Write a protein that binds this ligand. Sequence first.
Ligand code: NA
Ligand code: NA
Lengths: 389, 390
Amino acid sequence: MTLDDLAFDRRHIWHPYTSMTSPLPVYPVVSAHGCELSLAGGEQLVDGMSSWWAAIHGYNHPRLNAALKGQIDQMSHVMFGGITHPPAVALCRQLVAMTPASLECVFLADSGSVAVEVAMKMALQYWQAKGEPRRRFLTFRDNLFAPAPQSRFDGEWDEMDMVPFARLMAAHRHEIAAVILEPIVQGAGGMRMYHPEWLKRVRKMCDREGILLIADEIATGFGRTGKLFACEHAGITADILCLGKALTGGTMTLSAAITTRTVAETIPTFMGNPLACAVASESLRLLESGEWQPQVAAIEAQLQAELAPARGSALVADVRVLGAIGVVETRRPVNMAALQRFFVEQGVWIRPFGRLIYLMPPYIITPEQLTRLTRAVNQAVQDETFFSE
Amino acid sequence: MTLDDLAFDRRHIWHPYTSMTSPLPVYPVVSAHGCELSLAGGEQLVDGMSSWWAAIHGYNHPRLNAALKGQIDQMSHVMFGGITHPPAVALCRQLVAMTPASLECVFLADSGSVAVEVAMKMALQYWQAKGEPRRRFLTFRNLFAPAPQSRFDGEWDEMDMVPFARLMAAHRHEIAAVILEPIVQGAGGMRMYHPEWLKRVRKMCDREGILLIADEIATGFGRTGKLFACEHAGITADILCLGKALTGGTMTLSAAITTRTVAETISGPTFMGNPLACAVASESLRLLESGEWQPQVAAIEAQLQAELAPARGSALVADVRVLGAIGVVETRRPVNMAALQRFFVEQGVWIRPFGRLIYLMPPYIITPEQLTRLTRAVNQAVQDETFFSE
Ligand code: NA
Ligand code: NA
């Protein structure tokens, strides 16, 4: 990477959540290995982000690499219209086998958002097919927005938390096609965390009304909260389960909606992409050993222990840990340039956002690597200069 | 592929535009090379579909393979938030250089539909920032203008634009953008519109300050005989959407490219900027830099025109329309999908019809003899009433 390359990127390449008139500095990553990113200048960074959830096996994994290369040798891609192929069948067999018995029909898609859109369309066609059309969705913050439950996710449950959902349900039961939620951890909602009893109660209220439950586990799935699927924290199963990110080991995009036979019965170039299916199958094979379970429990326990002192910082509003996820929510938004520089100069890759400094490291991270991550977070939230007003 | 694999696919795996209670038969493909697909039984099929547009360089292409493997050796993926990397820069350099000078800010995305959604969100934020929030889009069949009736390759009747001009003027303060596919409607029944229509849209958008979004996810990268189909009208969009043939049909990636004025007025996504997809897209574009796609596509077009022309004489054919490496036979009655698909496979060709459409969009590397197999099969098909419902 050259100085001109960085000028070109700055002037011509959009990055997430940044402007093009006043972009923030970006760091040139040229390669990656293990739990580390290699900068163009040669600096190594301990990754604390898993490239946002997905890179649970780390970077440059030999088995993911070999799966990709082996599929390339046969075919990178063929259309799925009127055609099926070994990678799609192998992947769907794994997805059906590893999910609860009732989840058995797989709709492959490119991206997480498309799999959620597909789930919602399934819910629309379900009710249309049943002679009872329903067009509204209920989600948590003409759609219906219920507030988040207040009870601390790892503490005691107050039944009063369900009143706004219950009253919305009582008022609109017959118009609601589906409830859509992320189980426990709100990867799309400020990394907030909800009590599992809330999820248990939503499932029961849906059961009572015949309403479909759509679980978005694109962020939570595949072991990240300490359960293979985060729905397990409440003991419930969704009618439609949406999956992605760690599905491919974070090598390339792929997603899936898995539903029941009752939904499926009552019911374009890259759909089923062989290359992505082959690497996702290898990513799932890595999970089959069960090693992710003591890995994530060890990460969870270290995160609890090394982030607990952040609760003592006047700038910290909350610390919340679940599985291989540690969130420090601050009282004031971060100074993005200054704080990101500090992290890189400390040899760690941690990408904060607004009032959030959070860790979601790859499952293969070492204790010492993780301590580097939590050390930097604790140092950050003790200094005002890393925070605007 | 085993019988149990087929039974598992049928019972548990959705395919595009098919039911789950009564799926049509699907054919097991296990590998692909050149311009051919290899079925589990060893049969080779000549591909006429490019896996829907994108596989313009054919299958198992050595340069595309080496690009992918070379990137895997460095990294398959890293996030794009706070980070840039050599593959994203190399691809965006190519996309900026190969497009008109006004198109210079690249937003990379996962899939075709996301690039269009990003373009529309750009248009919304463009007007929101100018204190003039506009929320509606005008497309051709939201405001829907009648598709222009002038035959795409024939004479122009400017009366085609009167309904559009009426709608645009009546709603000029609600319209954030016109969205269209240039000439060929890959998402509109493979219909084809006159370039003068596209020229007039651009000029009307200019007078009103309305953004023009060109979806070239299907038409882009030489398919219509021009590098971008906008060239048939001599116009440039405010936002250009690209995908499919971007990666050589190896894996999904898309982009929305806009002007500096759009980008300035405006001013996590795990897989945005994916190094692996950018690396193979760069090599796909490198393959086009020789310009060899031009006479390849011109030869395909002339062979399509000649070998599809007799189908116009078939009582079952309403229209034949050919542009670049696209040949469309629109029938008067919809096809019997199972029986017609079996006939194509038995003939050794992969042609995937839909409703009243039997169409060809072969890889650019297809030989004359391979392509004649495709056109002969189509001509045989539309002379036989057995392949059509009522
Ligand atoms: Na299952
Ligand atoms: Na350009």
